[PDB]
């Protein structure tokens, strides 16, 4: 009953309402920090110079936006990959102006996510069950790390990271499509197949069980495995596109015998990408 032993028996105990565990020891502060800062910076936060051009972009509720259009703007383009802690800032108002809250939120959130995976494993151990829920959870984890961490690393700044907002997500998707043509990348096709097929198999399994309940184990194995594998693949696809290894490109493929070019659907898709791109790229 050493004080240290008593503490350990408290944390690694299956009688709390929510299991804490050693991974949860890191999970709780980081997640609480991320949630608190996200709430604060989503309700009210100054406009952020996303383009690093002294011109700001607002995203908070008190500055005009609603839930659909509000967001937490990524840290400024001038910062690059530099960590921007509050104590490493010239002035609080400036630190907000450069987009520090985004950095705070995403870093605490990513650490909390990986610790949450660890906590899942730990409790599976403490209860005496095979410890592979965490393996399945590793897929959406990979996806978030792709959009928030790996893509900015490949692109050199967190200004290319995903905004934390509903409309920011769509803006990110369209700019990503413009610059990398993700639709014609096979890994995203695997991901689309994964989500749609996962819904299909979920509906089929639920209908069958709820209809007759009024190797079969391999059935549930396949249920678990299919969408997880596809999400791993599409997360890897995003990560590869973060290193300028873009998808397929079939523009200007068929040419007339004399030398003219006959259009195909890929050219229409490329022209749509061209529109998205030229609307992007403020200057050149």
């Amino acid at each position: 009953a050493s004080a240290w032993e008593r503490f350990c028996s408290f944390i690694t105990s299956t009688n709390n309402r929510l299991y804490i565990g050693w991974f949860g020891v890191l999970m709780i502060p980081t997640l609480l920090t991320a949630v608190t800062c996200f709430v604060i910076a989503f309700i009210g936060a100054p406009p952020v110079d996303i383009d690093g051009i002294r011109e700001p972009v607002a995203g908070s509720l008190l500055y005009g936006n609603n839930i659909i259009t509000g967001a937490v703007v990524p840290s400024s383009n001038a910062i690059g990959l530099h960590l921007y802690p509050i104590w490493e800032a010239a002035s609080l108002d400036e630190w907000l102006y450069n987009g520090g809250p985004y950095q705070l939120i995403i870093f605490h959130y990513m650490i909390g996510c990986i610790c949450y995976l660890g906590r899942q494993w730990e409790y599976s151990y403490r209860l005496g069950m095979r410890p592979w829920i965490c393996v399945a959870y590793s897929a959406p984890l990979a996806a978030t790390y792709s959009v928030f961490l790996i893509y900015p690393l490949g692109q050199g700044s967190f200004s290319d990271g995903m905004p934390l907002g509903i409309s920011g997500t769509f803006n990110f998707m369209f700019v990503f499509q413009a610059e990398h043509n993700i639709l014609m990348h096979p890994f995203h096709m695997f991901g689309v197949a994964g989500v749609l097929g996962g819904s299909l198999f979920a509906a089929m399994h639920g209908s069958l069980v709820s209809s007759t309940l009024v190797n079969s184990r391999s059935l549930h194995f396949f249920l678990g495995a299919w969408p997880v594998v596809c999400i791993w693949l599409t997360a890897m696809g995003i990560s590869t596109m973060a290193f300028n290894l873009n998808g397929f490109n079939f523009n200007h493929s068929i040419v007339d015998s004399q030398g003219n070019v006959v259009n195909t659907w890929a050219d229409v898709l490329n022209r749509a990408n061209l529109g998205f791109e030229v609307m992007h790229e403020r200057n050149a």
Partner: peptide
């Protein structure tokens, strides 16, 4: 970079 990021993740 791409190959070894995928390898590292797996």
């Amino acid at each position: 970079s791409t190959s070894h990021f995928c390898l590292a993740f797996f």
